[PDB]
C-alpha cells in the first residue's frame, strides 16, 4: 500500500530491501540535510514512520491487515542523525556476497554445512569502518569458496554477547562440525584468505604418469571427475595456492591434481599453459578428446565457474525408485515437470552428508499422481524425513545454498507437518498449532524456522502444521485469514490466535499460557482441594457455567480478560455445570452463569458472595472482586491531611473523591490495591471532598476522583506534589517507584 509505495518497494520486499530504499530517502531528506524548510521534520516523518512499521514485523502485520487505521500514532518520531544513515546504517546492504545475519537465523545459517566467516561489527566503531571495504573485497574474492557474513552488534547485542564478541570488530569462523574459531590477524584481504584456507578441506595430488592414467581410468566408477593442471618449466600453470582454492571450491565434486610435465615428458606429448577438467570417463587419448574441457585461465573463480556449470545434475529417480525409498532415508527432492537454478546447488550432495540427507530430482511428468497427491503443481523443492514416515516440508524463498541447507537440516530434525485438506485436523480433540501462511510473504518465511524450533520442544504436547494459502486459497478463506502469517492454536473446540513476535521463545510462552490459563478450570474434586481448603489468605473468583447458556457464553471472554488482570492477586476458577451437574447442584447453583467470590478465611466471613450486579463485563467483575480485599488507605480529615501529608516526612498517594461520584466508586477498590502494593514504601490516603470541600478546594481538585502523589525530599525538608492521571494500580505504582529511586 502507501507505506511500500512511500519507500518505493514491493509488499514482498525483504528487510534488506526496505533498509536499502529507506537509506536512499533518508540521506536526501533528513532534516539535517535541508535546514531551509520548516517542514523538514514532517517530511521525514512520513518516510521514517513507514520504515519503522515495515521493519517491525508485528507492526507490519497490522498494516497489512488494516491500513494506517489499525496502527497507532506514536511511531516514526525518533530518528538517528544524518551521519548515522550515511556511515553507520546498512553498511553491507549493497554487497550481494555478504549475508546480513540477525539473531533468529544465525545459528542455523552458520552451521548449515558451509565454511562461514562472519564479521561482528558495530556502529560508532572506527575499527569496524576500516574493515568494511576489505570485507566487501574479501567476500568478492572468496565467492564459491566460503560464506561471508556480517552481524550488526549495534542491532544485535545479545547475539554478539552470546558469541563471545570482545571487541569491535570481531571475526569468527564457523562450521557445523567445530566450535567457532577467532581470527586475530591484521584484517588484510590476503591474510583473511590464508586464515580461511587453513580451515578449508583441500586435497590436491601430484600425479605420476602411472597415477594419472589410473586416476583417469578409475574416475568413472568413482563418479568424480578430475581437474588437472600440467606444469612445465619456463611456462605458467596454476599456482599452489590456486589449486588448493579450487580444491576447496569443488570439494566432493571434483578431484584436483597437477602433473610435472618435465617429469612426465611422454605423457605431456599428447597435450602439446593448460588446465584440463576430465568428466568421469573422459581420457586424454584422441578418442575421449571431446568430453575433456581444456582451460587456459590461471584464475580460480574463472575456472570454478566453468567447472560448476559443467557438472552433472542431481540423480534422477524414477517413480518406482521414489516410492521405494521415500519413507526410509531422508531425501531432498527437486520436483520438476519435463523440460528434459544455481549450479552452486550441486554442492548439496556433499554438504548434507553429515545429516544423511540424500539429494535427488524427480520428473513429475513421469508420474503426475505422485506430485499432485503432494499438491505439487509447479517445480518445487521438498525434504522428506523418512524413518518410516512420509512427513515432508516444502522450501520457500530464494533457492540459495546455505538457505536450502539450513532448511533441510532444521526440517528433518523438527516436527512441522505440511498440511493439506486431506490431513487437516478438522475433527481432532488433540492440540494443534497451525500456521496459515503465504510463501511470497517475507514475515511468513521468517516464521517457519521459529515454528520448527518450537516443534522440537512441543513434541508430545501438540502437533505443529503449516498450510500454504497460495495453494489452498479455499481453506485459508474458511478460517478468515486476512494477513500472512496467521498463527493459530486448536484446542478443545476453542480456537486461540497468536499475536506475539515471530520467535520460538514467545510462541512457547503463548502456548504455555494456553496450557496453564489464568482461568483455572475446576472439577468437583479440585474445587474442594483448592477453593474450599484455600489457605487463610487466598481468595477465589469462580464462574459456574453451562456451555449451553447464552449468558454463560457471553461471560467467558470477559471472565478470561478479567482473570489475566488478576494474576498474583485473586485466584480465578471456572466450573462446567453441564459436565458436573450433581456437584453444581451440591453447591446450589440455580442459574447460569453464577459468579461467586470466596473471601479470606476470617471470624465473620461469609461462605461466599454471589455477584448479582447488572453489568458482567471484565472491569465490573474485577472491581467487584478487588472490593473484598483489605483497605490499606487511611481516611483523612482536614487536620490529618495537613499534619500527615503536607507537613509529614514521607511519601503519600491521595485519592480525592466524592461518595456520590460514580467514577469514584469504580476506582476505590483499584486504589486499595495500589495502597497494598506500595505498603512500606508509600502511604495511601483518601479525602472525602463532599465532607471536606475546604481541603479539596485548597489541594487543587477540579473533579472526582483525583489522585495526587506527595513526595518527601529529606534534603530540603519538603513535600512535592504531582497528579496521577492513570487509574491503573500497576501503572501508577511503577510510575511512583520510578520517581523514588531518583532521589535515593
Ligand atoms: Cl572501536
From Swiss-Prot:
Disruption phenotype: Mice are viable and healthy but show enhanced endoplasmic reticulum stress response in the salivary gland.
EC number: 1.8.4.-
Tissue: Ubiquitous. Particularly abundant in secretory tissues. Ubiquitous in fetal tissues and tumor tissues. Higher expression in fetal tissues than in adult tissues. Expressed in testis, pancreas, fetal thymus and fetal kidney. High expression in heart, liver, kidney, and testis. Low expression in spleen and skeletal muscle.
UniProt xrefs under InterPro entries: DnaJ_domain (IPR001623), ER_disulfide_reductase (IPR052460), ERdj5 (IPR021170), ERdj5_TRX_C (IPR035674), ERdj5_TRX_N (IPR035673), J_dom_sf (IPR036869), Thioredoxin-like_sf (IPR036249), Thioredoxin_CS (IPR017937)
Cellular localization per UniProt: Endoplasmic reticulum lumen
Top enzyme category: oxidoreductase
GO MF: ATPase activator activity; ATPase binding; disulfide oxidoreductase activity; Hsp70 protein binding; misfolded protein binding; oxidoreductase activity, acting on a sulfur group of donors, disulfide as acceptor; protein-disulfide reductase activity; protein-folding chaperone binding
UniProt keyword list: Disulfide bond, Endoplasmic reticulum, Glycoprotein, Oxidoreductase, Redox-active center, Repeat, Signal
Tagged with keyword Endoplasmic reticulum: yes
UniProt xrefs under PROSITE patterns: DNAJ_2, ER_TARGET, THIOREDOXIN_1, THIOREDOXIN_2
Domain commentary: Thioredoxin domains 3 and 4 are the primary reductase domains. The thioredoxin-like regions Trxb 1 and 2 lack a redox-active CXXC motif.
Binding partners and assembly: Interacts with HSPA5 (via its J domain). Interacts with EDEM1.
Protein name: DnaJ homolog subfamily C member 10
Amino acid at each position: 500500500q502507501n507505506f511500500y509505495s512511500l519507500l518505493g518497494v514491493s509488499k514482498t520486499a525483504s528487510s534488506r530491501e526496505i533498509r536499502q530504499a529507506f537509506k536512499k530517502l533518508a540521506l536526501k531528506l533528513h532534516p539535517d540535510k535541508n535546514p531551509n524548510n520548516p517542514n523538514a521534520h514532517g517530511d521525514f516523518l512520513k518516510i521514517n514512520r513507514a520504515y519503522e512499521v515495515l521493519k517491525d514485523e508485528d507492526l507490519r502485520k497490522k498494516y497489512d491487515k488494516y491500513g494506517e487505521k489499525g496502527l497507532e500514532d506514536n511511531q516514526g518520531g525518533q530518528y538517528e542523525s544524518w551521519s548515522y544513515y550515511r556511515y553507520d546504517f546498512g553498511i553491507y546492504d549493497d554487497d550481494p556476497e555478504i549475508i546480513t545475519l540477525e539473531r533468529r537465523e544465525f545459528d542455523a545459517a552458520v552451521n548449515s554445512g558451509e565454511l562461514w566467516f562472519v564479521n561482528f561489527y558495530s556502529p560508532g566503531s572506527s575499527h569496524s569502518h576500516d574493515l568494511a571495504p576489505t570485507w566487501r573485497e574479501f567476500a568478492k574474492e572468496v565467492d564459491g569458496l566460503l560464506r561471508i557474513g556480517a552481524v550488526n552488534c549495534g542491532d544485535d547485542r545479545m547475539l554478539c554477547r552470546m558469541k563471545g564478541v570482545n571487541s569491535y570488530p570481531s571475526l569468527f569462523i564457523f562450521r557445523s562440525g567445530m566450535a567457532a574459531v577467532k581470527y586475530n590477524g591484521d584484517r588484510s584481504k590476503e591474510s583473511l584468505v590464508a586464515f580461511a584456507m587453513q580451515h578449508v578441506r583441500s586435497t590436491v595430488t601430484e600425479l605420476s604418469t602411472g597415477n594419472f592414467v589410473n586416476a583417469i581410468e578409475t574416475a568413472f566408477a568413482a563418479g568424480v571427475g578430475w581437474l588437472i593442471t600440467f606444469c612445465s618449466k619456463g611456462e605458467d600453470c596454476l599456482t599452489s595456492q590456486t589449486r588448493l582454492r579450487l580444491s576447496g571450491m569443488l570439494d566432493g565434486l571434483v578431484n584436483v591434481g597437477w602433473v610435472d610435465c618435465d617429469a612426465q615428458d611422454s605423457l605431456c606429448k599428447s597435450l602439446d599453459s593448460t588446465t584440463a577438467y576430465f568428466p568421469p570417463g573422459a581420457t586424454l587419448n584422441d578418442r575421449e578428446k571431446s568430453s575433456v574441457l581444456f582451460l587456459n585461465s590461471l584464475d580460480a573463480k574463472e575456472i570454478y565457474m566453468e567447472i560448476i556449470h559443467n557438472l552433472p545434475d542431481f540423480e534422477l529417480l524414477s517413480a518406482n525408485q521414489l516410492e521405494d525409498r521415500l519413507a526410509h532415508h531422508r531425501w531432498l527432492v527437486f520436483f520438476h515437470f519435463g523440460k528434459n537454478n544455481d549450479p552452486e546447488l550441486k554442492k548439496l550432495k556433499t554438504l548434507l552428508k553429515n545429516e544423511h540427507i540424500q539429494v535427488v530430482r524427480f520428473d513429475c511428468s513421469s508420474a503426475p499422481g505422485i506430485c499432485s497427491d503432494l499438491y505439487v503443481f509447479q517445480p518445487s523443492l521438498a525434504v522428506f524425513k523418512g524413518q518410516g514416515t512420509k512427513e515432508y516440508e516444502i522450501h520457500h524463498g530464494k533457492k540459495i545454498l546455505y538457505d536450502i541447507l539450513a532448511f533441510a537440516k532444521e526440517s528433518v530434525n523438527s516436527h512441522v507437518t505440511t498440511l493439506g485438506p486431506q490431513n487437516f485436523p478438522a475433527s481432532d480433540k488433540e492440540p494443534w498449532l497451525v500456521d496459515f501462511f503465504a510463501p511470497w510473504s517475507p514475515p511468513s518465511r521468517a516464521l517457519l524456522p521459529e515454528l520448527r524450533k518450537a516443534s522440537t520442544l512441543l513434541y508430545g504436547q501438540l502437533k505443529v502444521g503449516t498450510l500454504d494459502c497460495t495453494i489452498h486459497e479455499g481453506l485459508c478463506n474458511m478460517y478468515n485469514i486476512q494477513a500472512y502469517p496467521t498463527t493459530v492454536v486448536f484446542n478443545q473446540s476453542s480456537i486461540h490466535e497468536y499475536e506475539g513476535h515471530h520467535s520460538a521463545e514467545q510462541i512457547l510462552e503463548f502456548i504455555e499460557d494456553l496450557r496453564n490459563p489464568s482461568v483455572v478450570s475446576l472439577t468437583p474434586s479440585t474445587f474442594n482441594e483448592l477453593v474450599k481448603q484455600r489457605k487463610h489468605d487466598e481468595v477465589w473468583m469462580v464462574d459456574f457455567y453451562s456451555p449451553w447458556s447464552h449468558p454463560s457464553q457471553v461471560l467467558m471472554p470477559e471472565w478470561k480478560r478479567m482473570a489475566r488482570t488478576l494474576t498474583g492477586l485473586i485466584n480465578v476458577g471456572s466450573v462446567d455445570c453441564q459436565q458436573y451437574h450433581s456437584f453444581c447442584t451440591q453447591e446450589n447453583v440455580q442459574r447460569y452463569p453464577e459468579i461467586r467470590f470466596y473471601p479470606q478465611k476470617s471470624s465473620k466471613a461469609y461462605q461466599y458472595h454471589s455477584y448479582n450486579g447488572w453489568n458482567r463485563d471484565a472491569y465490573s467483575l474485577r472491581s467487584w472482586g478487588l472490593g473484598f480485599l483489605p483497605q490499606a488507605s487511611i481516611d483523612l480529615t482536614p487536620q490529618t491531611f495537613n499534619e500527615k501529608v503536607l507537613q509529614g516526612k514521607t511519601h503519600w498517594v491521595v485519592d480525592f473523591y466524592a461518595p456520590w461520584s460514580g467514577p469514584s466508586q469504580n476506582f476505590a477498590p483499584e486504589f486499595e490495591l495500589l495502597a497494598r502494593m506500595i505498603k512500606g514504601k508509600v502511604r495511601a490516603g483518601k479525602v472525602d471532598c463532599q465532607a471536606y470541600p475546604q481541603t479539596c478546594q485548597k489541594a487543587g481538585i477540579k473533579a472526582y476522583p483525583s489522585v495526587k502523589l506527595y513526595q518527601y525530599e529529606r534534603a530540603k525538608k519538603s513535600i512535592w506534589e504531582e497528579q496521577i492521571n492513570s487509574r491503573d494500580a500497576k501503572t501508577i505504582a511503577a510510575l511512583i517507584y520510578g520517581k523514588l529511586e531518583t532521589l535515593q
